[PDB]
Amino acid sequence: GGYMLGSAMSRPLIHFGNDYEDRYYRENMYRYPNQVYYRPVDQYSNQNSFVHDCVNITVKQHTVTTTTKGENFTETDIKIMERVVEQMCITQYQQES
């Protein structure tokens, strides 16, 4: 058993409220996922619990893939990643519903 993929998308435009995070996302955009992993949407009764799992699974997979190549995420990266992935997971739940 694995997870469903989504198709790759352009990393979303996000106006982060924290200005330094806002700039950091742009500077370091390629560090973050452009596609999401998830359990099938018909297994969820609402957007919120889907997105919750989609973010957890996707961040787990990306962090694992990154760590094993000898690379690292900063605490900033993690905060930005969670937001990025949340937006893509919402998109995915809307597109795939």
Q: Which residues of the shown chain bind Na ion in the complex (CB under 5 A)?
A: 19, 73, 77
Nearest residue (CB) to Cl ion, 10 versus 45:
10
7 sits near Cl ion (criterion: CB under 5 A): no
Token reading at 68: 């094993």
Close Cβ partners of 97 (under 8 Å, ≥ 6 residues apart): 41
| Binds Cl ion by CB under 5 A, chosen from 7, 10, 45, 68 | 10
- Which partner, Na ion, Cl ion, none, binds residue 19 by CB below 5 to 8 Å per kind? Na ion
Q: Which is nearer to Cl ion, 1 or 15 (CB)?
A: 15
At 89, which helix (H) or strand (E)?
A: helix 75-96
Which of residues 11 and 31 has its CB atom nearest to Cl ion in the complex? Answer: 11
Q: Note whether 31 binds Cl ion by CB under 5 A.
A: no
On whether the CB atoms of residues 95 and 60 are closer than 8 A, the answer is: no
Enumerate residues 6+ apart whose C-beta is below 8 A from 47: 90, 93, 94
* Residues near Cl ion, by CB under 5 A: 10-11
